[PDB]
């Protein structure tokens, strides 16, 4: 995405990309798809159209 | 005296030991393709290096 310059090529920033890329996979997908299900399956919901 | 007190003769420190923690570091850095400070791939360069 800064492939004019920042183009991201350290090792250390990458051994960083890594944990976050674990938390978004293993933890923020699973809450996200933890409430379309609880949502999903009780209550009644507006929209405003 | 006045000769009487003096620091103890303690080793100085070997030329190996930093040379060779050197060599080490690199040999990691090129059996495997690890480095520090170096820039990592994507799947653009894994398909096309160009």
């Given at each position: 995405a800064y492939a004019t310059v920042?183009?991201?090529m350290n090792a250390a920033q990458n051994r960083l990309?890594?944990?976050?890329?674990?938390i978004?996979?293993?933890?923020?997908?699973?809450?996200?798809?933890?409430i379309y299900n609880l949502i999903r399956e009780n209550g009644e919901?507006?929209?405003?159209? | 005296r006045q000769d009487?007190?003096?620091l103890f003769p303690y080793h100085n420190l070997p030329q190996g030991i930093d040379g060779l923690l050197?060599?080490?570091?690199?040999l990691k850095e090129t059996?495997?393709?690890?480095?520090?400070l170096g820039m990592g791939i994507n799947p653009?360069?894994?398909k096309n290096d160009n």
């Amino acid at each position: 995405a800064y492939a004019t310059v920042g183009l991201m090529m350290n090792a250390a920033q990458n051994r960083l990309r890594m944990v976050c890329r674990n938390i978004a996979h293993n933890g923020m997908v699973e809450l996200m798809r933890g409430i379309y299900n609880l949502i999903r399956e009780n209550g009644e919901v507006p929209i405003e159209v | 005296r006045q000769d009487a007190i003096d620091l103890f003769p303690y080793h100085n420190l070997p030329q190996g030991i930093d040379g060779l923690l050197g060599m080490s570091e690199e040999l990691k850095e090129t059996r495997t393709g690890v480095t520090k400070l170096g820039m990592g791939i994507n799947p653009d360069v894994f398909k096309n290096d160009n």
